[PDB]
Each structure stands twice: as C-alpha cells, then as structure tokens.
C-alpha cells in the first residue's frame, strides 16, 4: 500500500 | 464543563484533524479519551459537517456495546474537545502489524461484531462510510468498537440514497467510483475489504504502491483497479471464506451480501462463513474473544504506538495571529454533557 489508507471528503 | 475539569495524562493518538489524549475527570477520577481538534483546520463545508455529524451520531447512536460513547463536548477559543470512552486494546491495524495474517475464526469473530455495529447504525438511518482497520479498536477484554463517526451520513430514510464522494481510497466502493447514488451497501463492501485484509494479511489492491511506473501508484489507478480488475482470493482460505469475501466484494451493490433492502443482515447471518455464530450471545458480549490484549501499568498504554506516548503532555501554545482569524459563530451550541 501507499497511504491510500488516508480518509478524505469531496 | 471545560479544560479546567481535566488532568491531562498522556498523548495516545493522532488523526488528520485531531490529537488524542488520556485525561482524568477531576470530579470523579474516571479516565477518558479526549479528541482535540484545532479550529484552524476546520474551514470548508467538508470540515464543519465532519464535526457536526460526529457530535450528532455520538448522541443519537453510540449506546450500542461495539460503539464508542461520548462523555461531553466543550471548546476553548482555538479548539473543539470531545471526551469519549477510553478504549485501550489498540486498533486492528496495530494488531494486524504484529500478527500478519489472522485465523479465520478470529476474522469471523471480529467481522460478526462489526456487522452488529453496522446493522445498528443502518437501522438508525446512518451510513458509517469509513470502515477501516484504523477505525476498529479492541477494548481491554478483546471485543471491537467502531470509533470515527465524522464520515457518517445520517437522517437517511429507509430506501433513500446519498451522493457524497467520501471515505478512504482502499475501502471505497465501486458505486461511489461509478458516480452512482448509494446507500448502506458501501459499508458491506468495506467490511469485505476489511475481512480480506484480516484473512489474507494484505489489501486486495496491494499492488498499488510497488510499481515502477509512478502513474500506477496513484489514487486514480487504485480506483481503476477497484472497478475493473478481478479480486483473486488466496488458495489458503477455505470455501466459506472465499465465498463471503467474493460475496461482500461483489462490484454490483444490488447483488452484494448485506445489501438486499429487506433481508440484508439476515443474509449475512445465514452465510456458511457465519454458521456457528450465536448472534444474540455475540451482541451481549458473551462470546469469549479469541485474543485478550495485554494491559499493563496504571493506564494500559501498552497498545498505543510509542511515537504518540513519548510526545510531551501539553496542548501546544496558541498563536494569536491564527486564533483571531477564526469564525467562532460556526461553533455556537457545541457544548454537551451526557444525561448520565
């Protein structure tokens, strides 16, 4: 993985 | 209630928005977890909604045994404070790093308890929308709790859908990526991914990161892989495991496990993977967990990563050039005390 385990919102 | 009423003990955690501390209520000598969010960070629509819904879900939900309850809310000029129950057994990411793969019976236990938590939120009209190893904690006895409610949709009438593009790329569901309206189905997809990680020891999209091409270590390349590439199940895992993972990771939400609008949760309970699960005893915390986390010393700080616990026990001095620029109007009526 890459730290595409980070939350986000749009 | 305010910051005066709390004796700060140690730093235990850090999100994007928040810093987390162990605190003691001076009134009662009960210890709690304190999520400290700087108002500096909360600026757009997407940020104010994150705090407002987190508060709303802590109230309206969170009575359940596998959800974190809220003691109280308050503010200084620079920060919002949530006082919540202290859960000291670590998270499933922390636990997965120590023991690379889990046995299927462990994965069955953890995914059953999550399923009850999800189902409870679903029947209160709430989509979790951010299921991930990081957001599933173990308590001291070894049962799960879901924690971060900031991503939740709420007020969802039964059969309604919503449209917001949110979550965590690894766990994002094909419906969201296709631009479709979505309901509770996205939560069951995420559980599928989560269960894959527990039993396989890696994400199903774990290739995204290792490639020689920079453009294939991208969020967009992950989303392409989620939509178009077939998820191969490792040969080790049993027929039951393979079935539940492939059923929860069905790209079509209509035909995914958990997602029938009538019989969704029932279908999960009736899957061969959950044959021997006593769901009433599970929910009453009567099934003996497969792992008991080690609790040591006065507060049980064993299962928090040392980078957090080594950090000094303060709140960072304010900078008045930043603090004077804040709209305090947006956080009126934030205070809350739980009706004991």
Domains defined along chain B, listed by start: 3-87+298-332 (3.30.200.20), 92-283 (1.10.510.10)
Check residue B169 and report its DSSP letter: G
Query: Which of B170, B200, B217, B221 should be substituted to probe chain A, the one whose Cβ sees the most A Cβ atoms within 10 Å?
Result: B170
Per-residue burial over B149-176, b = 16 or more CB atoms within 10 Å of its CB, e = otherwise: bbbbbbebeeeeeeeeebbbbbbbbbbb
Query: What contacts 24+ positions apart, CB below 8 Å, involve B179-185?
Result: B182/B253, B183/B127, B183/B156, B183/B159, B183/B253, B184/B118, B184/B122, B184/B127, B184/B156, B184/B258, B184/B259, B184/B264, B185/B253, B185/B256, B185/B258, B185/B259
Gap between the Cα atoms of B22 and B8, Å rounded: 6
Contact B205, B275 (CB under 8 A): no
Gap between the Cα atoms of B139 and B293, Å rounded: 8
Contact B81, B125 (CB under 8 A): no
Residues paired with residue B167 on neighbouring β-strands, in sequence order = A8
Count of other CB atoms within 10 angstroms of residue B322: 12
Per-residue burial over B212-242, b = 16 or more CB atoms within 10 Å of its CB, e = otherwise: eeeebbbeebbbeebeeeebebeeebeeebb
Helix axes B239-248, B104-123, angle to 10 degrees: 30
Q: From B207, which residue of chain A is nearest by alpha-carbon distance? A: A1
Tokens of B31: 């210890």
Task: Give resolution, Å, one decimal.
Answer: 2.6
Count of other CB atoms within 10 angstroms of residue B72: 19
Q: Do B169 and A9 touch (CB under 8 A)?
A: no
Query: Which of B37, B94, B148, B168 should be substituted to probe chain A, the one whose Cβ sees the most A Cβ atoms within 10 Å?
Result: B168
Active-site residue set of B:
130
Gap between the Cα atoms of B57 and B115, Å rounded: 18
Residue B175, SS3?
A: helix
Residue B264, SS3?
A: helix
Gap between the Cα atoms of B176 and B188, Å rounded: 13
Chain B segment 153-182 residues within 8 A of A by beta carbon are 164-170
Contact B326, B39 (CB under 8 A): yes
Which stretches does DSSP call E strand in B39-124?
A: 70-75, 79-84
Among left, alpha and beta (phi > 0; psi -120 to 50; other), residue B116 is: alpha
Q: Do B208 and A2 touch (CB under 8 A)?
A: yes
Distances (CA, A) of B5 to B8, B23, B28, B83, B267: 10, 10, 10, 11, 48
Number of residues that this document lists for chain A: 10
Gap between the Cα atoms of B301 and B313, Å rounded: 14
CA dihedral sign, ordered B18, B20, B25, B28 = positive
Residue B193, SS3?
A: helix
Q: Which of B95, B87, B99, B93 is nearest to B12 (CA)?
A: B87
Contact B169, B237 (CB under 8 A): no
Per-residue burial over A1-10, b = 16 or more CB atoms within 10 Å of its CB, e = otherwise: beebeebbbe
Q: Which of B198, B196, B188 is nearest to B267 (CA)?
A: B188
Gap between the Cα atoms of B127 and B107, Å rounded: 22
Elucidation method: X-ray
Set of chain A residues whose Cβ sits within 8 Å of the Cβ of B132: 5, 7
Tokens of B42: 């909360």
**Residue whose pair of structure tokens reads 């499933």 in the numeric block:** B92
**Helix intervals (H) in B229-337:** 239-248, 264-269, 279-283, 306-310, 320-323
Closest CB from B151, B164, B202 relative to A7: B151
**Residue whose pair of structure tokens reads 């449209």 in the numeric block:** B163
Q: Do A5 and B170 touch (CB under 8 A)?
A: yes
Contact B9, B26 (CB under 8 A): no
**A–B interface: beta-carbon pairs under 8 A:** 47
- End-to-end CA gap in chain A: 22
Q: Is B151 on the interface with A (CB under 8 A)?
A: yes
Gap between the Cα atoms of B175 and B249, Å rounded: 12
């Amino acid at each position: 993985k890459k730290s595409l385990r980070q939350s986000f919102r749009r | 209630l305010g910051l005066q009423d709390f004796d700060l003990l140690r730093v235990i955690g850090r999100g994007s928005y928040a810093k987390v501390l162990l605190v003691r209520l001076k009134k009662t000598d009960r210890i709690y977890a304190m999520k400290v969010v700087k108002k500096e960070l909360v600026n757009d629509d997407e940020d104010i909604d994150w705090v407002q819904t987190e508060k709303h879900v802590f109230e309206q939900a969170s009575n359940h045994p596998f959800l974190v309850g809220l003691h109280s809310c308050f503010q200084t000029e620079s920060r919002l404070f949530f006082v919540i129950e202290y859960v000291n057994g670590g998270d499933l990411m922390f636990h997965m790093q120590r023991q690379r793969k889990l046995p299927e019976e462990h994965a069955r236990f953890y995914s059953a308890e999550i399923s009850l938590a999800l189902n409870y939120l679903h029947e209160r009209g709430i989509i979790y929308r951010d299921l991930k190893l990081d957001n599933v904690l173990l308590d001291s006895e070894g049962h799960i709790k879901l924690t971060d409610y900031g991503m939740c949709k709420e007020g969802l009438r039964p059969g309604d859908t919503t449209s917001t593009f949110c979550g965590t790329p690894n766990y994002i569901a094909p419906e969201i990526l296709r631009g479709e309206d979505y309901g509770f189905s996205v939560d069951w997809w995420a559980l599928g991914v989560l269960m894959f990680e527990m039993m396989a020891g890696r994400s199903p999209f774990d290739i995204v990161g290792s490639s020689d091409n920079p453009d294939q270590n991208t969020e967009d390349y992950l989303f392409q892989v989620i939509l178009e590439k077939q998820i191969r199940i490792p040969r080790s895992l049993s027929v039951k495991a393979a079935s539940v993972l492939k059923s929860f990771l069905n790209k079509d939400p209509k035909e995914r496990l958990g997602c029938h609008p009538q019989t969704g949760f029932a279908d999960i309970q009736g899957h061969p993977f959950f044959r021997n699960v006593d769901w009433d005893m599970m929910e009453q915390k009567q099934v003996v967990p497969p792992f008991k986390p080690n609790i040591s010393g006065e507060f049980g700080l064993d299962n928090f990563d040392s980078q957090f616990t080594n950090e000094p026990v303060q709140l960072t001095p304010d900078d008045d050039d930043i603090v004077r620029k804040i709209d305090q109007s947006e956080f009126e009526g934030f205070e809350y005390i739980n009706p004991l």
